[PDB]
């Protein structure tokens, strides 16, 4: 009954980046997706710009929607399924916020009834427009929208965890209404697991939406503390996968590694291929992985200003559509895992994750790089123990353990 | 040598409002400008959306520029000259701010060297693209950009007056560089004359840029304090014209009434025609008026949300291009003033304007509705004295007075 992982890329348009919606060129998209499918991927994750699609609360532009459908059709012709992220929102250090949510109309993104009603109509419209596309996977509410909810954001839209979970439900309700039965989820960046009192929580990620989405980025302190060529750096995606399982109510709830990339300087370009192989191999030794989706397809145009340096070189391909060695290595790992490798065995040893109550997760920073749970997991991993995780409050739950096939339970104090 | 006033409208596209740049339709623009020229106007004031034209600091979209040129050409065919406002920025309660100026990239609009360098390139590019258009008037830096500089803005980019004047110079330098010899100016809303310690000052408006631009809006407290059918309400545009002259170094520096409109409920629709006639008649009794430019050509689409109620009905035409009675009245006033009315006589009586030092204007609120200078001017006007204004520091300057033809000088204390 073992789950079979899918392989895709986050689509970063080579001509004009996500600004290409302002000058939409289907032939340029066709060429981008051509070089994507030639690498053997089976899906793309694609990004509308929210204020370009909804420049006024009650103006959702049909032409923008039509363009998204044409993109989805071009991908379908090429054997690529499409997940669409709705609320961007945040992309690569930039916040794209509609004028009707800011300054003179500043209205909290998660709690204002008019903005939330506008967000719902937006998501529902996209989902409904794509509902007749057989290659349309479903919606992700918005890329790492939790980054708006608190520190370190310079101007956050603050919310309680209950408010955040309620907002997520309404957003996913809208996706479900536009495209019933599709794969609708939300995706939060790693503050949801690592930052104490961050409003978006691990329970939100593991108990709302169809699958848990994780974004694995070793610039978060991991590569800095442990080195580029290290257990922790190579295993960081696998760790996020197994950590996220602890809060899941369903024992076989899949986990989607929706973002993973090789950020220089933390991963120099010369080590990107090697890093990509080890990371993919390591995470695919985890059961129930829904898929691996690399960030990103194409380098960002170097004529575009003010990106953090790491953002420019994250592509599997260059801006002129040449395949990088790291692109070649990911394609090779995809090919090997689709055909030549067996399913991963169950992880029967569980590391106890004690995070405080854990619905609220007030001390989740023990899971962050340098934390006791983090280092206990990498130590076990290095010892060959192939660990999963379990919450302290379920660590003696014979039904939880047996449902998961867990036969051994250890704490970080046990690991030392 | 008397100056002859021009007549135009602020172009508010009927299909999609200023969001029409996202779905640019030249035939829809042609039809809009057709109904404009049929009313007898000779120019339009037109508004790019800054973040649509410059979505990234070093991406100024050539297609957006091409669209602006096609709009300018369509207008030229119809005998309409074009002023282009650059930095929007602010339009009708909405702030359109590029992602590269906000939150994670928050960089002060008036002082950050990278943003200011980006603004310069933007203005220079627009001006240069239109420089070969014989109907291209010139640039206005940006619509009421001073609203970003302080209270009551909820999130201002604060600046000292010296910083604001320096920024204006650099912005106009860029316009001049792209289109030498053209009519380049800046336009600040009435806080520049009315709000104590507002960073943009009357000296900035009267001593930087080719002409002084004023925006006359009787919802600023005037209609509320004095009534819709009153001297002060009818004369408010004329007052702003004559007030703005006090800070001018050149005695014949023209003043452009770049915005004037009839906002309901302060001016009910049934009184818009009558209000428009009286306002135009009153301001055109002021010498050196560069022109009168009505806000706006077309009602805002009522399907667009979150505008202040007054914004929807400010058009001379409805959203379906029917001419309103107020449109008919403005066209009639234009026709009469172009052919049937003599030039206004000089205003030889000057009201003293004591504002504190006045370069800095720390007590300019004496010019605001309810202020001593304001009410002294309306009282003189009602008495038939046809007043101009003079700064306290120049009130005994025999050369200033004679250069202006001023033969009588009175203070508000004199008027009582
Ligand atoms: C402010 C900032 O740059 N935040 C980044 C975000 O852009 C990125 O998507 C995320 C990936 O995990 O990492 C965050 O640290
Ligand atoms: C915050 C706000 O609505 N400000 C308005 C502005 O939209 C308008 O252009 C201006 C005209 O003078 O009047 C201001 O009061």
CA B263 to ligand 2 centroid distance, Å = 12
State whether A56 and B155 contact (CB < 8 Å): no
Query: Residue A214: helix, strand or coil by DSSP?
Result: strand
Residue from B96, B153, B217 to probe ligand 2 pocket by mutation (most atoms less than 8 Å from CB): B217
Binding residues of B for N-acetyl-D-glucosamine are: 90, 144
Q: Measuring CA to CA, how many Å separate A286 from each of A40, A342, A354? A: 22, 12, 21
Query: Residue A85: helix, strand or coil by DSSP?
Result: strand
A198 lines ligand 1 (CB under 6 A): no
Shortest Cα–Cα distance, A414 to chain B (Å): 42
Q: Can you read off the two tokens belonging to residue B327?
A: 């449109």
Burial of B416 (0-12, 13-18, 19+ CB in 10 A): exposed
Return the CA Rg of chain A. 20
Cβ-contact A287, A248 below 8 angstroms = no
* H-type alpha helices, B185-295: 191-194, 202-207, 222-226, 231-245, 272-283
Counting atoms of ligand 1 from 1, which one is nearest the CA of A92? 7
Q: Å resolution of this model?
A: 2.0
State whether B95 and A104 contact (CB < 8 Å): yes
The neighbour count for residue B410, using CB atoms within 10 Å, is 17
**How many angstroms from the chain centroid is the CA of residue A102?**
26
State whether A154 and B304 contact (CB < 8 Å): no
Residue A82, φ and ψ in degrees, nearest 5: -130, 125
State whether A59 and B303 contact (CB < 8 Å): yes
d(CA A216, CA A12): 18
* Domain parsing of chain A, residue ranges: 6-340
d(CA A207, CA A155): 28
State whether A305 and B100 contact (CB < 8 Å): yes
> B68: left (phi > 0), else alpha (psi -120 to 50), else beta?
alpha
d(CA A284, CA A278): 10
CA A215 to ligand 1 centroid distance, Å = 10
Q: Output b/e per residue, B268-286; b: 16+ Cβ within 10 A.
A: eeebbbbbbbbbbebbbbb
d(CA A233, CA A238): 10
Q: Indicate which residue's Cα is closest to atom 1 of ligand 1.
A: A93
Residue (of A117, A34, A20) closest to A317 by Cα position: A34
Q: Indicate which residue's Cα is closest to atom 15 of ligand 2.
A: B220
Q: Indicate which residue's Cα is closest to atom 8 of ligand 2.
A: B92
B295 lines ligand 2 (CB under 6 A): no
State whether A58 and B305 contact (CB < 8 Å): yes
- What are the beta bridge partners of residue A319? none
The neighbour count for residue A31, using CB atoms within 10 Å, is 15
State whether B305 and A22 contact (CB < 8 Å): no
Task: For tokens 């310690």, name the residue.
Answer: B197
Question: CATH homologous superfamily of domain A6-340?
Answer: Glycosidases (3.20.20.80)
Counting atoms of ligand 2 from 1, which one is nearest the CA of A104? 1
Closest residue, chain B, to A100 (C-alpha):
B94
Residue B64, φ and ψ in degrees, nearest 5: -60, -45
- What are the beta bridge partners of residue B95? B90
Q: A interface mutation test: which of B15, B66, B151, B306 has the most A CBs within 10 A?
A: B306
Closest residue, chain A, to B107 (C-alpha):
A306
d(CA B54, CA B46): 17
Counting atoms of ligand 2 from 1, which one is nearest the CA of B220? 15
How many CA atoms lie less than 13 Å away from A125 in the CB half-sphere? 22
Tell me which chain A residues have a C-beta less than 8 angstroms from the C-beta of B96. Answer: 99
How many CA atoms lie less than 13 Å away from B306 in the CB half-sphere? 22
- Structure-derived torsion over alpha carbons of residues B410, B412, B414, B416, reported in degrees to the nearest 10: 150
Tell me which chain A residues have a C-beta less than 8 angstroms from the C-beta of B23. Answer: 61, 63
* H-type alpha helices, B246-382: 272-283, 309-312, 325-339, 372-382
State whether A61 and B23 contact (CB < 8 Å): yes
Q: Which ligand is nearest to the CA of A90?
A: 1
d(CA B408, CA B383): 15
Residue A293, φ and ψ in degrees, nearest 5: -125, 110
d(CA A257, CA A239): 11
State whether B56 and A96 contact (CB < 8 Å): no
- Residues in chain B preceding a C-to-N separation beyond 2.5 angstroms (breaks): none
d(CA A244, CA B320): 55
Shortest Cα–Cα distance, A403 to chain B (Å): 44
Shortest Cα–Cα distance, B22 to chain A (Å): 7
Q: Measuring CA to CA, how many Å separate B372 from each of B10, B363, B377, B383? A: 32, 11, 9, 16
Cα of first residue to Cα of last residue in chain A, in angstroms, is 36
Q: Is the peptide bond before A285 cis (omega within 30 degrees of 0)?
A: no
Q: CB-based contacts of A11: which residues, under 8 Å, 6+ apart?
A: A32, A33, A36, A44, A45, A46, A47, A296, A297
Cα of first residue to Cα of last residue in chain B, in angstroms, is 36
Please work out, in degrees rounded to the nearest 5, the angle formed at the alpha carbon of residue B149 by the alpha carbons of B213 and B296. 40
Tell me which chain B residues have a C-beta less than 8 angstroms from the C-beta of A305. Answer: 56-58, 100, 114
Closest residue, chain A, to B18 (C-alpha):
A55
State whether A99 and B95 contact (CB < 8 Å): yes
Residue ranges with strand state E in A37-153: 43-46, 81-85, 90-91, 94-95, 136-143
Measured between CB atoms, which of B23, B96, B155 is closest to A99?
B96
d(CA A105, CA A102): 5
Cβ-contact A134, B139 below 8 angstroms = no
Residue ranges with strand state E in B86-173: 90-91, 94-95, 136-143
**B93 in A contact zone (CB under 8 Å):** yes
* Residues belonging to chain B: 416
Residue from B85, B144, B188 to probe ligand 2 pocket by mutation (most atoms less than 8 Å from CB): B144
Cβ-contact B93, B144 below 8 angstroms = no
**Side by side, which strands form the sheet with A349-353?**
A388-391, A349-353, A408-410
State whether B63 and A23 contact (CB < 8 Å): yes
Residue (of B57, B83, B58) closest to B72 by Cα position: B83
Q: What is the 3-state secondary structure (H, E, C) of A338-366?
A: HHCCCCCCCCCEEEEECCCCCCCCCCHHH
Q: Can you read off the two tokens belonging to residue A245?
A: 């399982």
B148 lines ligand 2 (CB under 6 A): no
Tell me which chain A residues have a C-beta less than 8 angstroms from the C-beta of B102. Answer: 95, 97, 102
Burial of B402 (0-12, 13-18, 19+ CB in 10 A): exposed
Tell me which chain A residues have a C-beta less than 8 angstroms from the C-beta of B59. Answer: 16, 19, 303-304
Going by the DSSP 8-state scheme, the letter that residue A92 receives in this structure is T
Query: Residue B203: helix, strand or coil by DSSP?
Result: helix
CA A253 to ligand 1 centroid distance, Å = 26
Q: CB-based contacts of B180: which residues, under 8 Å, 6+ apart?
A: B131
- What are the beta bridge partners of residue B91? B94
Cβ-contact B376, B415 below 8 angstroms = yes
Cβ-contact B236, B222 below 8 angstroms = yes
Measured between CB atoms, which of A22, A155, A304 is closest to B61?
A22
Binding residues of B are: 90, 144
A167 lines ligand 1 (CB under 6 A): no
The neighbour count for residue A359, using CB atoms within 10 Å, is 18
Burial of A143 (0-12, 13-18, 19+ CB in 10 A): buried
Residue from A89, A96, A144 to probe ligand 1 pocket by mutation (most atoms less than 8 Å from CB): A144
State whether A23 and B61 contact (CB < 8 Å): yes
Residue (of A141, A144, A56, A39) closest to A99 by Cα position: A56
Residue A86, φ and ψ in degrees, nearest 5: -85, -70
d(CA B340, CA A66): 54
Which secondary-structure segment (H or E) carries A388? strand A388-391
CA B52 to ligand 2 centroid distance, Å = 22
Residue B398, φ and ψ in degrees, nearest 5: -60, -30
Q: What is the 3-state secondary structure (H, E, C) of A30-43?
A: HHHHHHHHCCCCCE
Q: Can you read off the two tokens belonging to residue A349?
A: 């040893």
Please work out, in degrees rounded to the nearest 5, the angle formed at the alpha carbon of residue A155 by the alpha carbons of A303 and A151. 100
A144 lines ligand 1 (CB under 6 A): yes
**B152 in A contact zone (CB under 8 Å):** no
Cβ-contact B20, B67 below 8 angstroms = no
CA A191 to ligand 1 centroid distance, Å = 10
How many CA atoms lie less than 13 Å away from A333 in the CB half-sphere? 27
Residue B212, φ and ψ in degrees, nearest 5: -85, 130
* Residues belonging to chain A: 416
The DSSP line for B15-60 is TTGGGGGGG--HHHHHHHHHHHHTTT--EEEE---HHHH-SBTTB-
d(CA A167, CA A146): 11
Q: Which ligand is nearest to the CA of B146?
A: 2
CA B189 to ligand 2 centroid distance, Å = 7
């Amino acid at each position: 009954s073992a789950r079979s992982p899918r392989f895709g890329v986050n689509y970063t348009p080579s001509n004009g980046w996500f600004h290409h919606w302002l000058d939409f060129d289907l032939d340029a998209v066709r060429a981008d997706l051509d070089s994507v499918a030639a690498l053997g991927f089976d899906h793309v994750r694609v990004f509308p710009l929210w204020p370009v699609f909804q420049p006024n609360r009650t103006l959702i532009r049909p032409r923008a929607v039509e363009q998204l459908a044409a993109l989805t059709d071009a991908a379908g012709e090429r054997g690529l399924d499409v997940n669409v992220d709705g609320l961007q929102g945040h992309l690569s250090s930039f916040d794209f916020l509609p004028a009707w949510t800011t300054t003179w109309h500043r209205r909290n993104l998660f709690t204002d009834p008019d903005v939330v009603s506008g967000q719902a109509e937006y998501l529902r419209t996209l989902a409904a427009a794509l509902a007749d596309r057989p290659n349309f996977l479903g919606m992700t509410v918005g890329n790492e929208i939790n980054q708006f909810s608190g520190h370190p954001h310079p101007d956050p839209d603050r919310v309680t965890p209950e408010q955040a979970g309620d907002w997520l439900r309404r957003m996913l309700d809208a996706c479900e209404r536009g495209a019933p039965g599709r794969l609708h989820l939300h995706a939060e960046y790693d503050a949801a697991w690592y930052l104490d009192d961050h409003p978006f929580t691990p329970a939100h990620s593991a108990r709302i939406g169809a699958v848990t989405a994780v974004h694995s980025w070793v610039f978060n302190g991991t590569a800095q503390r442990y080195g580029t060529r290290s257990t922790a750096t190579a295993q960081h995606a696998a760790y996020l996968v197994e950590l996220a399982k602890a809060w899941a109510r369903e024992p076989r709830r899949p986990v989607w590694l929706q973002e993973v990339g090789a950020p220089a300087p933390h991963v120099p370009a010369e080590y990107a291929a090697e890093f990509a192989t080890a990371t993919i191999d390591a995470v695919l030794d985890c059961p129930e992985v829904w898929g691996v989706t690399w960030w990103c397809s194409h380098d960002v145009d170097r004529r575009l200003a003010d990106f953090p340096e790491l953002e420019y070189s994250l592509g599997l391909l260059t801006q002129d559509r040449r395949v990088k060695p790291a692109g070649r290595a990911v394609a090779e790992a995809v090919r090997r895992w689709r055909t030549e490798t067996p399913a991963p065995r169950p992880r029967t040893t569980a590391l106890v994750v004690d995070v405080g109550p854990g619905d609220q997760a007030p001390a989740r920073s023990v899971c962050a790089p340098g934390g006791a749970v983090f280092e206990a997991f990498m130590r076990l991993t290095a010892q060959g123990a192939r660990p999963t995780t379990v919450l302290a409050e379920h660590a003696t739950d014979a039904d939880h353990l047996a449902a998961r096939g867990i036969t051994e339970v250890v704490t970080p104090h046990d690991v030392h």
